[PDB]
Design a protein around this nucleic acid. Sequence first.
RNA 1: CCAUAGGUUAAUGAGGCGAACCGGGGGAACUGAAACAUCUAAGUACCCCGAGGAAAAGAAAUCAACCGAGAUUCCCCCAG
RNA 2: UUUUGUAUAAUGGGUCAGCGACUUAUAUUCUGUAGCAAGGUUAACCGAAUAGGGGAGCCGAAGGGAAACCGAGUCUUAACU
RNA 3: AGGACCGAACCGACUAAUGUUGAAAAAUUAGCGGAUGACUUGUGGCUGGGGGUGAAAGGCCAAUCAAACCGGGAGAUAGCU
RNA 4: GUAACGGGGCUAAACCAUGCACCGAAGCUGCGGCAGCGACGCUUAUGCGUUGUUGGGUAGGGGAGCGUUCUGUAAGCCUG
RNA 5: GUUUAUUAAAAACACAGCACUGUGCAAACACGAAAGUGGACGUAUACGGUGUGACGCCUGCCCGGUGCCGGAAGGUUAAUU
RNA 6: AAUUCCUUGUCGGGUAAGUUCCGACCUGCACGAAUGGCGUAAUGAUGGCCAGGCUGUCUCCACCCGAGACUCAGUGAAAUUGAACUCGCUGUGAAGAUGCAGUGUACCCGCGGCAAGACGGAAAGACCCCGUGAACCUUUACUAUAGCUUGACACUGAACAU
RNA 7: CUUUAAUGUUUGAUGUUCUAACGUUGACCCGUAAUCCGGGUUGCGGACAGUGUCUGGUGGGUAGUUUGACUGGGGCGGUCUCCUCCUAAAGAGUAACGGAGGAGCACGAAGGUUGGCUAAUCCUGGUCGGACAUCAGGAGGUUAGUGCAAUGGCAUAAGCCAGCUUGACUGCGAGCGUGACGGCGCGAGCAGGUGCGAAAGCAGGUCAUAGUGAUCCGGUGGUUCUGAAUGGAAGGGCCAUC
Lengths: 52, 51, 76, 64
Amino acid sequence: GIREKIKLVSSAGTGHFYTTTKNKRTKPEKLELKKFDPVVRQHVIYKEAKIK
Amino acid sequence: RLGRGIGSGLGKTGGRGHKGQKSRSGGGVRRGFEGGQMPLYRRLPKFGFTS
Amino acid sequence: TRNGRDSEAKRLGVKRFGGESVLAGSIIVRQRGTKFHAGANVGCGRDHTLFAKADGKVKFEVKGPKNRKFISIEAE
Amino acid sequence: PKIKTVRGAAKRFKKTGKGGFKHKHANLRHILTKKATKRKRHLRPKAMVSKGDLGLVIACLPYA
RNA sequence: CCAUAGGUUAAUGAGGCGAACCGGGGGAACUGAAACAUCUAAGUACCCCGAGGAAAAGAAAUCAACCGAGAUUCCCCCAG
RNA sequence: UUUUGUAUAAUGGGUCAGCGACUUAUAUUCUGUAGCAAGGUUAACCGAAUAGGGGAGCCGAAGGGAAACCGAGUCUUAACU
RNA sequence: AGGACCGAACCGACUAAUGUUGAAAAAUUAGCGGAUGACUUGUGGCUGGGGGUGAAAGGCCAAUCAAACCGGGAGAUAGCU
RNA sequence: GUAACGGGGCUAAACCAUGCACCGAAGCUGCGGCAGCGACGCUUAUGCGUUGUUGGGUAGGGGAGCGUUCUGUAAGCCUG
RNA sequence: GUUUAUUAAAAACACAGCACUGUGCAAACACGAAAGUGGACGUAUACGGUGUGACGCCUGCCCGGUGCCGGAAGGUUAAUU
RNA sequence: AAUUCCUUGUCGGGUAAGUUCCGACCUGCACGAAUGGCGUAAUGAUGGCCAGGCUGUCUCCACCCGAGACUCAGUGAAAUUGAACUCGCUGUGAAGAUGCAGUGUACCCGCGGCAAGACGGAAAGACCCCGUGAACCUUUACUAUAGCUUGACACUGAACAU
RNA sequence: CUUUAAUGUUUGAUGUUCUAACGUUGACCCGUAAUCCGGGUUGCGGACAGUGUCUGGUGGGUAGUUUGACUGGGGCGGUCUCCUCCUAAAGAGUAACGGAGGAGCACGAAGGUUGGCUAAUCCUGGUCGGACAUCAGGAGGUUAGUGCAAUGGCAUAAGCCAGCUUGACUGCGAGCGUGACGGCGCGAGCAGGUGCGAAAGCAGGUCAUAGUGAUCCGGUGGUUCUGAAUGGAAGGGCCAUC
Ligand SMILES: [Mg+2]
Ligand SMILES: [Mg+2]
Ligand SMILES: [Mg+2]
Ligand SMILES: [Mg+2]
Ligand SMILES: [Mg+2]
Ligand SMILES: [Mg+2]
Ligand SMILES: [Mg+2]
Ligand SMILES: [Mg+2]
Ligand SMILES: [Mg+2]
Ligand SMILES: [Mg+2]
Ligand SMILES: [Mg+2]
Ligand SMILES: [Mg+2]
Ligand SMILES: [Mg+2]
Ligand SMILES: [Mg+2]
Ligand SMILES: [Mg+2]
Ligand SMILES: [Mg+2]
Ligand SMILES: [Mg+2]
Ligand SMILES: [Mg+2]
Ligand SMILES: [Mg+2]
Ligand SMILES: [Mg+2]
Ligand SMILES: [Mg+2]
Ligand SMILES: [Mg+2]
Ligand SMILES: [Mg+2]
Ligand SMILES: [Mg+2]
Ligand SMILES: [Mg+2]
Ligand SMILES: [Mg+2]
Ligand SMILES: [Mg+2]
Ligand SMILES: [Mg+2]
Ligand SMILES: [Mg+2]
Ligand SMILES: [Mg+2]
Ligand SMILES: [Mg+2]
Ligand SMILES: [Mg+2]
Ligand SMILES: [Mg+2]
Ligand SMILES: [Mg+2]
Ligand SMILES: [Mg+2]
Ligand SMILES: [Mg+2]
Ligand SMILES: [Mg+2]
Ligand SMILES: [Mg+2]
Ligand SMILES: [Mg+2]
Ligand SMILES: [Mg+2]
Ligand SMILES: [Mg+2]
Ligand SMILES: [Mg+2]
Ligand SMILES: [Mg+2]
Ligand SMILES: [Mg+2]
Ligand SMILES: [Mg+2]
Ligand SMILES: [Mg+2]
Ligand SMILES: [Mg+2]
Ligand SMILES: [Mg+2]
Ligand SMILES: [Mg+2]
Ligand SMILES: [Mg+2]
Ligand SMILES: [Mg+2]
Ligand SMILES: [Mg+2]
Ligand SMILES: [Mg+2]
Ligand SMILES: [Mg+2]
């Protein structure tokens, strides 16, 4: 296993985040997706971050 | 004659193992406890009658 | 040797047979591939698990040009 | 002498109204990301101690 | 060189023994953990020193919680 | 006695007599039984003392929740039909 | 002169027979090796148990030695008989 | 040591095909006895022409007893 | 010559000799919590350790590995600050 | 070859015939230079091989002398032992029978003998395996540790020079 | 700020010289009838040596232990989890050191939705161009295709293309399936917010079945849950997550 897990953090500042994986050899550009934020109870754009 | 000492070969556990239902006071499930699930005579439907 | 391996049996097959009364959401058969196809008042899961979408009696029937086997629920 | 409770079990099981014991589900510590959300959601709520395991919990908790 | 060390007398006191209990100085392993190192056994066994009819401890640089208690020791709870 | 299985050529015993192994303490659960009963019961201790006193406590009559809390409801959730 | 020679005492213990519930828990009989030397022996002394001592075999250390004996922990432990 | 009808022996006392007998078990049926259990009739803590039925048994589970020593009963009762 | 007292006396051990190495004497080393003692009332022509094992002829090649010895610039690095 | 698996290697010597011995050969499975190599007089209750002498070692045992064994008298054990009215054969059978089946044989009981069997006696198998047994021993197994060694601080000061 | 020249300071680094700690198993004197010891005198050494605490290295010198199981006895060899088929005797399930193969991933598209499309192979022609490249037609009818083993499935395609997208959604969950259990799996529907469609509707990842690891301990984010007198805090709990 060489694919590494990443976290997608909401841009709304609630601090909620999702986790997934991404291929580091390809697709260098950051991952942007619209996902539901339970804190604001709305679907917002989630931005890629680093798991730590 | 179980649970009677080291020389018996069933001592210090009484042949009951280590912390199972059989080693506990009053422990063991009665016949038919099936782990939490509804037992087979209830997943399945009842049938027939006695005439 | 280099063999002697297997997986636990998954217990497929028909759980509720023809004419049996079932509650909505009860799975009738678990299968690999569409051995049976969903008919009236019967749903199909993501693993081709057929489940009842309404209360009623289970009925098996064969219809269509392909001579396939279909499962439907007659909701009285 | 007084019976000693298994302290590890006393920190994980609470007695209920009808004499049962509730415990938290396993498999939700550190490999949960690869598990589907539905699987994690079902593991979050508290669970009842099974009929097979009733004797062991009561055995570990003789005074409660 | 005084001194001091040392030396010779004279007075008192101590020496050893003894069951357990007590204080202190040292201090295991088998065993349990179904193995085994942390841990347990256990500050137990044992060794050593000292004391008494008891010993030890003891008269708050203690607890409480905004109310108060008022040295130490022992028992039953608190509580497995 | 141990075994799937022993007349077994598997173990035990020369014989008799005597002795020789399911007990004890505490705690806990279950059954039976007795008493009292939404209550039951005291422990140490006191005590001419198996009485009586002592209700300090313990269990039960209310639970849910990790907990704060709420409460015949409560938790889960923004909210649950 | 000689860790020289042959050979008693003395010391060793190579072979064979007997003996093996023995005369004897290691010996006897017939032979055998050393026999002024790294010899042998008497009487005392010293080295103590994970230690001694060992011209070294795991040998010996009171008929017991890959860890003496005695007591204690101790009724160690024994999924085995 | 005959040793491949258990043996004798058998030309049917073998085999094949039909029969009708008989022998044959702790099975079954009789005639008694004991015990468990079930629904009844009256009566039912007792019990009754009850009746029906059951009663092989290791590990093991349940139930009911015997006998031994000691205490009360018992300064009683038994006994030169 | 020595050895498995009690099934093995040997080709085993020891042995003189040889070589390496440590040791400057409050020696190394060893026994000892330590004091001290042995080494040794000895001093490198001495002592300890190791291997080989009279004598005769001889004892070749490898320092990569593992040890030991020497070097100390650099890299890394403890307590401490 | 105390070293050679194939192997009784091959050749020679010794014998009537020698898988051992001796001499060579080298193809050293898997010798080798102080964990010494090769030789070596002497020594050896040293190992192997050969010859002479010598013999009951043997062909092949015979006799004799003693001590037992045997008989009598006296004294008087031991290991062992479920109980025995304790035969052969064939078959069966925890699968090798005095005890089962079938069959045969056998009057009751001592004494001297021989050991085929009673899976004979001795000693809870030493070989094999097992147990999350024990112990010693080894090491670049693990974790420690005595010891040895390094530095800091303390015991521990002064002056001067860089 | 740099470059820094000098300046005091504060710590060290050596080197040299002292004596007074300390050493003396140097000499001499006394205790003393004494090769011990102590004291004195003196010489030598000397801030070393030596010892204590701490610390790095070394350390079978000495200890305490570990060193698996299955297995046609064991050892050696092989095997230990997960997936597919057969064995498996037409429900389920079913063993062997039985017979055959795979997995410890991949994919922000290889997901979602809408719209559209249908393959292999072969033949006949056609510049380079051949057995096989792209073109046209015919036959064929899935003999292909499916991210990857095998089995089943798949044309309404589950296969292929395009457009728009992030439902690879959050809280839940009637009722079921399958496990001894831990657990694993399926699920209509409900709530809140989405995406694609004009809508009906579909979407809680991928044709399905492998691609995985409990608890303890520790780390990260969030959280009016807790906060040992009180207010905080630490720490703990819960949520997310390593
Ligand atoms: Mg008991
Ligand atoms: Mg048992
Ligand atoms: Mg243990
Ligand atoms: Mg007194
Ligand atoms: Mg038994
Ligand atoms: Mg029988
Ligand atoms: Mg027998
Ligand atoms: Mg009272
Ligand atoms: Mg009260
Ligand atoms: Mg509710
Ligand atoms: Mg001589
Ligand atoms: Mg001689
Ligand atoms: Mg002589
Ligand atoms: Mg001895
Ligand atoms: Mg030992
Ligand atoms: Mg002892
Ligand atoms: Mg003990
Ligand atoms: Mg014992
Ligand atoms: Mg009968
Ligand atoms: Mg019974
Ligand atoms: Mg009496
Ligand atoms: Mg009496
Ligand atoms: Mg000699
Ligand atoms: Mg001997
Ligand atoms: Mg001797
Ligand atoms: Mg000998
Ligand atoms: Mg040698
Ligand atoms: Mg050399
Ligand atoms: Mg080197
Ligand atoms: Mg080199
Ligand atoms: Mg050979
Ligand atoms: Mg020849
Ligand atoms: Mg030769
Ligand atoms: Mg050699
Ligand atoms: Mg050499
Ligand atoms: Mg010789
Ligand atoms: Mg001759
Ligand atoms: Mg007999
Ligand atoms: Mg036979
Ligand atoms: Mg016989
Ligand atoms: Mg005889
Ligand atoms: Mg004989
Ligand atoms: Mg025998
Ligand atoms: Mg044995
Ligand atoms: Mg060791
Ligand atoms: Mg231990
Ligand atoms: Mg094994
Ligand atoms: Mg094992
Ligand atoms: Mg079947
Ligand atoms: Mg099946
Ligand atoms: Mg379409
Ligand atoms: Mg697809
Ligand atoms: Mg797709
Ligand atoms: Mg506080």
